[PDB]
Each structure stands twice: as C-alpha cells, then as structure tokens.
Design a protein around this ligand. Structure first.
Ligand code: CUA
Ligand code: CUA
Ligand code: NA
Ligand code: NA
Ligand code: ZN
Ligand code: ZN
Lengths: 566, 581
C-alpha cells in the first residue's frame, strides 16, 4: 500500500493533529505525514495574527487574555455516523475551553469557556443522527461554589461534571454532575447513549434522552452565574439517578472507544491488562431496571498485555489497542473475545507489533464512523528515544504510521511531532471541501463589516481614514503589490485600528500587514477583511509592510504611519 | 559515495536543517533528507508548550521586547571558525520588531536577543566567516529620520537614512553601525574578515542607482578605535558614515554598480566572489573579492572593474548557492526554475568568449525565492543536497483553504543532473534555511545546573536562602509569594500551597530527574500559565492569583506512567477575609 507520495502526487487522506501543549491544530497529508497547514486556536500566531486581530479576539472572548492552551482530542462532525466535513472540535485542558474549527476555511470560528469546571480533557462527538452535541469531560473535582470558603474536595458539593455543548451554536446545552473523575468519552450510533471512563472503577453511561427530557421539563438547577441546565448524575444513598448508570470496570480505566459496528463501548484497562467490552444493546435494559447487576452489560474482557490505553477499529471486526508498558499495538478480534468471555477456548489475539516507544492513543482511518476502512493506523508514542536525531533536552513524539490494509500490520513511517499532539483524526480527501477564496459575507469577519457599516465604509472599495477623538480607524483595500492607503498621520497616544480588505481574486495571493516595532502582524487572504488595533505610542515615522510574499515586487508593498508628538 | 534519499523507520537523517519560522517567528529543526520537523525553538513567538514568552527566564532574555508576541524571520545562519561551521550558535533576524536573536545549539534554545537601536526592520543577516564569527552583520531595511522624534518626516532629509549593523556575536551587544546610501537588501561576508557586502538600491535620477556596497571592516574598526565616530540618541553604539559625499567615497564603503534592484548577495564557497542576484535584471553580477583591496586603494579606474562576470541566466534571479565543485545554483522567480551554471565559465564569457556556462534549468513549483546547498556557506560545501524555497505551492499539495503552504523542494545535486526528490510544505513562509552535517551539531540531553539560561533565577533564589536542588518551600513577602519546589516524576515537590487573592505568585520548579527525556510541565488551570522543565533545568513563572478558591495545577508533558497523578492545588483565600486596600 501507497506509503510514498512523490513530487506532484497528492495525499489520499487529511490528518488533523492536536497541537498538544502548543495549543494549535495541524493539518497533515496522509500517508506522506507532511504538515500542510497550522490552524491557530489557543496559541497566539504571529503569522496570521490570531490572538492579535480583532476578529480572532472576538471569537476568543475574554479568554483572549490567555496565550496558552493544552490540546489532546481532535474530532470531526458526523451525519448519520459518517464524517460530514463541517467542523472539527478540540479541547483545552489548560483554560477549560472547547474550540470549533470550520473545515471549509480551516480556521477556528467559535470558542467557549466551559462554566463552573476545571480542565477540559476527554472530548468526543455525537454520531447519530448527527453531531448535535459535543461531549466534553472536565477532569478535576472542585468545590461548588469555588469562592474560597470551602476547599474540601470531599465536601458534598465538590465534584466535576460531564459537559454537553451545542455543536452548531457553541453554547452550553447541559452539564451532568458525576461521581469521580472523568477520563475519556465516546458516543453510540443512535444518539441515546454516551459513556465515559471515570477514576476514583467504572464506565459511567449517560441516557442522553433522559437528560434531554429533564431539560425540556425544567427539572434542573443552575450553578453560579451560568444559565446552563445542571443535572445530578451522582448516586445518592446507593440509588441511581435517571441519567446515569455506573458499570464497574478494572482498573483506573483509560480510553473509551465505540466500535465502528456500534456494538461496544470498549474501555481500556490501564492497570488491568485487559479491555472491558460493554454491550450497547444491553444498555436500555440496564436503565429500565431489567438487569440484575450492572456488570451484566459486560460481554467481553480480553487479556491483551501490559498497559492497555486506547482502542481503534478496522471495520473488519478487529480492534487495535495500544499497550503502553509492553510498547506495542495488539490486534484482536472482538467477537472472538466475546465468545472467550463465555468460556469458549478461542484465541482472539491476531498480532502484536512493536512501537517506539510507550504508545498512548492510536487512530485508524475512519474509525469513528460506520465507514471505518481499515487502511491506515497511527500510534502516537510518548518516548521517541533514538528514533530521531537528538535535538537537545526536549524530544518529539513519535507518531508511527502503520499499514493495516492486510492481515499483517506493517510499520511504514516514524513521524516526529512537537509538544505531544497526543491524538489525531483522519478523513478521506473527498470528505473535506475547502474554499479557495473567502466569501465576502463570511461570519468570521461579520462584526468587522458591521463596524465598517457604522462608519459609512464600503470595504470592497474604500480607502479612508476616520477620526473619532483619540481613535483612528483606517480602512483600506489591498491588491498586490500596493496597499490602498500608503500613508496616514495620527497623534501620539491615538488608538489606531487598521482594517484591510484583500480585493485580489487570484487564489493563494495572501497579503500581510506588519507595523514595525509595534508588535502588530496579521494576514489577509483573498476576499478576506482583517483588522487590528494598537496604540501609536511612539512619535515619528513608522513603516508598515506586507509580510507575505505576494508578487515579484513584494518589497514595495509598504506604507508609512506618521505620529505627531504629544 | 551514493547518498541516502529516503529515511525509513529506525534510520536517522544525515543532516540537521535549521528553518526560519517565517512570519510565525520561531526556528525549526528538521532532519534532512527526510524533511521531517524534529523540534521547534521559540524565538520571537510565544510558545504555549515550553512557556517561552511567559516564563521569567525567557522574558529576561527578551528584555523590553517581551511585550511583543510576534516576529518575522527570514535568514538563519550558523557560527563559523576558519570558514567552517563550529556548531556553537545560530542567529536569525526579526524584521517586524527590529531584532537579532542567538540560539545556543547545545540546548536548542534562544539564549540572547537584541533590539538594534535607531533602525527599523532587520532583514538581511549573515555571519563573519574568518577567522571566526566575531560579528553578526544585519541590514536595516527602511530609511527613517534621525532623530525620529516626529519633527521631521521627510525621507530625503540629510539625516534620513538606514544603517548596516554589526553585532558582537559572543556578547550580543552592538559593535558598530555604518550609514549607507539607499535601502539594504541582503548581505554576506568574505573568507578573510576584511570585507562584507550588501545589495542596496536607490542628475535627479541617474541610470546607476543599484549597487552592491562593500564594507572595509578593517577601516571601520580603525575608526572606532581612533574615536572617529558619532552616536545617535541614547545608544553608545559607534556610528560611521559610509555614504558618498558629492562623489567622494568614505573610507568605509565602495558602491559597485549592479543591476537592477539586486536581491541575493552570496559569497562563493571558494572565497572568490560576492555574487549578487539581478532580480529585475536577468543576470547575476560577480564581484572579484581579490580585487577589493585594489578598489579601496584607488588602483582601479572604475568600481565596475571589480565585476568579472555577469551571466545572463533567466527571468527574476533572486538567490545563489554553491556545490563546492565550481557550480553556482540560482533561483529564477519568474521563470520558476533553479539554474545550474559554472562560475569560471561565466567569467570567461564576460571576457567575450563564447562558452555555455549554463548547465541545466530545473523546473520548481512555484516562484522560488532563496535556495540553500548543504554546507554552501563554508569552504566545506559538499555538493550533496539543495533546498529551493518556493512561494506559491498551488496544486502541489491537498487544498487547505485560502492560505497555502510554502513549497520547500529537496533536490539531489550530488551528480551532474539535478533531481527533484521531495516537496516539503511549510508554514508561514520560512523563506530560507541552513543545513549542517549531523557531526557538526552536539546537543545536551541533561542541563548543567550552572547554565546561564537560568542563572539569574538561581541568584534570585539565593537571596531567599534557597538551595534549588533540594528545597520545597513557600516564601512569603508582602503580597508576593515565591514557591520553590523540586520535581521528580511523577510528583511535584510542593503539592498544595495557600495564598491571598491578589497575591503575585512566582512558581520556580527544578526538575531533579537525571534521566534523559523526562520532561515535566506546569500548568495552572484557568490562569494562562504553562511551562516546560527538562531534566536538571530550573524554570519559573509569575502570575496573579486573581480568583478565590481552589485552583488545580498539573504536569502537562508526559513524564512517567503515573503522569496523570502529577498534580497539585493552589488555594486562594478570598480578598474579603484579608485587609482591604
Ligand atoms: Cu503583499 Cu508581499
Ligand atoms: Cu511530570 Cu507528566
Ligand atoms: Na464563544
Ligand atoms: Na539582550
Ligand atoms: Zn487522551
Ligand atoms: Zn531573504
């Protein structure tokens, strides 16, 4: 199979990598494993101005004050259990956020700080009938309220919550209080159930239908100043709530992965050298009180090796699980494991492949959908040791591409990556459709169009300087190789906003705008409007220039800001 | 020798590649020929992963410029001794905020940074080669008034100009600046230490308004030593005037006419030529370095007499590199090619001989700017690999929305025929890169406890009576709290501490693991705090505890099977329970 993409040939899949502790999302081509694009999210990007521009800071809201993020779990929206190419979602463990990326423009377009929680870690999407909810785990137990009166993590009001975000509006849908700490999560192939591993064990299963019914009936509380409906999924005096069931699983379980045939939530055993297989079609009976014991929903518990952490699927009936301690990927047959659990003498283990070294997550192509195609697998290992040239005290993660198309897994490529991406997701080339040039009506800069409208500005044509007290709003078009406004004058101390509309119509003619020695930088792609605000705190003449190479005469796309002394 | 071209699992790259991070502001370490990124080195960007731009150590190195979250990089170069890479430092420019940064290649971190005074936009940058990299040479691109205090905006005033800049590579303080006529583009240095050269351009309009300005560094140093210099503003940097005055040359410069708006300025690896790319002229011009002493001594009738070749190459020549076999390779931005040509044959053609100095034109994809052959900047130029960095990748990669990657194409030049081998997409237009042999780079896996990178922090701790290798203590000082802890996977040495709302909290962590690749992190949830601490490093970070209640901190970098348990809690007592101001 493939492996090599030579010059002039194109990759067959898109890969979306978490940016790890660096806070961005990265677009790779598969199988070449080359990085095609970086999408800034929680990081501040000098190149495009994300975190500096008004459009980006508007999307980030108050959290624009933070310059960091910590990403782990990238997932793509689905319709009828298949990737639909609309959105990517990702967590921020550092500042408790979820971000949405629009796959048509490859930019973060919405971001939410999850209220009344600390640290968004595990994250996955509803599959069916479509991605109505983003499900996100908050990892750390905190007091409620967290106002400094109570610090006791055993207090009855100290807990964490499972979080549901409306994928389309990017507002909170509901939160469910749980017992324990939440690790990973996944959803079924109907919309009724979701599940999460939780430590301090179990897999907690949520009846999303029951949660929704309670929200619609108004049977919920709110916490603090958030309107989010809050439901109590904890056990009370050994009694279950309508919303949750706690299924005992060993032991401090890690990954929680839904098989592509929709049959199983598979929890990785971590301390237990096993995975536990929860039969999704027994969950209705569990919630209806027809089973004697929550353990009755467990239909398999295969013994796999030391340190199972995560599981993925080839769509052919096999599961692939990382063994962190043994440092391998183990391929095993799920139905054979189920028969073994009944006492049948059958060997469900197909192969163990050594990986290098200490794998955490792994991801097979289309594995989160009923179209799982069994072509490529990436295992993301933490300790790369001698697999790459030494580069000082830090080391790259080793993301190893493995051909799973035949009976034998074959290691084909070691891909070093920065800041521990942790997990990734692949999509067929034909599942992703991107815009070549911006729509003038795009919501990404719609607030800036509205601001311009208030100033009487037609952004497609105008080159004007608006004076408003000590505020100056410069509006210009740009067309390589000239800025539409090549000089302007302000007073020292003025707050200057520069709004640039790139009116080039040629694909890939990106412009930039940098004000020398003012910390101002941003990108403006064809038909985009971008804006940036800074204080002209230095008298004298100050050059601005187009940063992105756009033309043979790129070096002459410059201008001058003249700042009259106070 | 037949060189490896693909690197399979378990095999290692043969060269390090140091890529400019372009408008993104970092430096990137690649493996060559795989073209895979092995590491990112934060420089002018703020890095969430390691905390560069957030930590006290990094902000101390950045100085006042730590207030900027952006940079614009182009020109990465490695220090040299006797015209060979010595693997000590890499330097790079910042065009956006007028800086030069130094990276220590043993720790792979930026260890020094300088804002060049009295200029705007540091663009071209290259290093002295011989006898070693004493100076970093850096062009400021834009003409500005002096002083630039808002009284005079006229760019044709007698005090409006830009300057060529020399920074002491070892001290990272300014050495001198030379005023020039026109705007400066690119620069390179000879193989003796006496000469450097830069491309620059700009009756009322003469035909001759494009040149390569040559600097007599020896003459510059003599004027500094004699005290024949001025200073500008509050900078003590010696400023020499290298402008032409009513046709008379200064002692410091000569202007060699070279068409037209010339771009690249590249010293051949045999030390014979400065080669300027003609850009708007479809040529390169070859300046004979061995004729420069005569030029400065007045033994030549015309500065053009130092030109010994001017090959016609194609449309839009921008940059030139060298295989060490006598061939030059030049990018053609408009024709979209790399052209291989023989330098000594171009020289013969300049004397009138009909000889075809052009050997091959290779199509590249598309619009190449800079290009770089392995070891090309040294007398060890080995003729193995060439990277051409092209601006418009068009359909060479899958579409990814309106913004596109640069196409950095790896080309095998080991034989007579250039062969295109790999298309490498890169983010934010790196522009240029530099390669070094694996054996020219020696990195540390474990920090030394006396490393200057965090020596200021060590000194601070000593004022508190702290032994950083052992102590787990919370020092209170008014409304400042200084937490000091060791860390050893999988535990922080301080797992809980209490402060008052509003306290300024500094957390200093010393990773006392002595095993390679056991990096720790430190993130305070919902406070915008994140940093790396590698084995034997001390790292520190300061933030305000502005929110009452219990606030978790955790180890971000995977360090241990029990990584998920490497957590702690900051308790913040509410302001209403303490004295009020
Ligand atoms: Cu616009 Cu370069
Ligand atoms: Cu220390 Cu993970
Ligand atoms: Na929002
Ligand atoms: Na400095
Ligand atoms: Zn994870
Ligand atoms: Zn350049």
């Amino acid at each position: 199979q493939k492996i090599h993409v030579g010059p002039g040939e194109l990759d067959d899949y898109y890969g979306f990598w978490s940016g790890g502790h660096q806070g961005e999302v990265r677009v790779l081509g598969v199988p070449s494993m080359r990085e095609l694009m970086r999408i800034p999210v929680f990081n501040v990007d000098s190149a495009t101005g994300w975190g500096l521009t008004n459009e980006s800071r508007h999307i980030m809201g108050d959290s624009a004050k933070f310059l960091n993020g910590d990403c782990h779990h990238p997932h793509i929206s689905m319709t009828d259990g298949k990737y639909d190419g609309k959105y990517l979602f990702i967590n921020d463990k550092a500042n408790s956020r979820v971000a949405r990326i629009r796959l048509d423009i490859m930019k973060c377009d919405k971001m939410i700080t999850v209220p009344n929680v600390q640290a968004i870690h595990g994250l996955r999407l509803q599959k069916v009938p479509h991605t109505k909810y983003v499900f996100a785990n908050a990892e750390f137990i905190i007091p409620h309220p967290n106002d400094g009166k109570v610090f006791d993590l055993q207090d009855e009001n100290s807990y964490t919550m499972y979080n549901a975000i409306d994928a389309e509006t990017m507002e909170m849908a509901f939160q469910v209080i749980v017992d324990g700490n939440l690790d990973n999560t996944d959803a079924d192939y109907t919309g009724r159930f979701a599940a999460a591993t939780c430590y301090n064990d179990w897999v907690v299963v949520f009846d999303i239908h029951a949660v929704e019914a309670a929200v619609k009936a108004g049977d919920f509380i709110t916490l603090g100043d958030s309107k989010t409906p809050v439901l109590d999924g904890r056990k009370k005096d050994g009694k279950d709530s309508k919303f949750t069931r706690y299924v005992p699983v060993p032991k401090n379980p890690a990954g929680c992965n839904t098989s592509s045939d929709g049959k199983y939530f598979i929890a990785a055993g971590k301390l237990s050298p096993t995975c536990s297989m929860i039969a999704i079609d027994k969950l209705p009976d569990l919630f209806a009180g027809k089973l004697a014991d929550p353990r009755d929903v467990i239909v398999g518990e295969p013994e796999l090796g030391l340190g199972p952490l995560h599981t993925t699927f080839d769509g052919r009936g096999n599961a692939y699980t990382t063994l962190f301690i043994d440092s391998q990927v183990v391929k095993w047959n799920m139905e054979e494991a189920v028969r073994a659990y009944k006492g049948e003498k059958v060997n469900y283990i197909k192969q163990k492949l050594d990986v290098h070294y200490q794998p955490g997550h792994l991801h097979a192509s289309l594995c989160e959908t009923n179209e799982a195609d069994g072509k490529w697998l990436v295992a993301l290992s933490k300790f790369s040791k001698d697999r790459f040239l030494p580069v000082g005290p830090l080391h790259p993660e080793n993301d190893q591409l493995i051909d799973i198309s035949g009976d034998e897994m074959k290691l084909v490529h070691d891909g070093p990556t920065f800041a521990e991406p942790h997990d990734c997701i692949m999509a067929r080339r034909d599942q992703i459709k991107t815009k070549k040039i911006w729509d003038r009506n795009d919501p990404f800069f719609a607030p800036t169009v509205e601001m311009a409208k208030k100033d009487g500005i037609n952004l497609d044509t105008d080159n004007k300087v608006i004076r408003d007290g000590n505020k100056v709003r410069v509006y210009m078009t740009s067309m390589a190789p000239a800025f539409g406004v090549q000089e302007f004058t302000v007073k020292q101390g003025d707050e200057v906003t520069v709004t640039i509309t790139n009116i080039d119509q040629i694909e890939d003619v990106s412009h930039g705008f940098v004000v020398v020695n003012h910390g101002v930088s941003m990108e403006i792609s064809p038909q985009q409007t971008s804006s940036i605000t800074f204080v002209a705190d230095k008298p004298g003449l100050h050059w601005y220039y187009c940063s992105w190479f756009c033309h043979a005469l790129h070096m002459e796309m410059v201008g001058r800001m003249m700042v009259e002394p106070a």
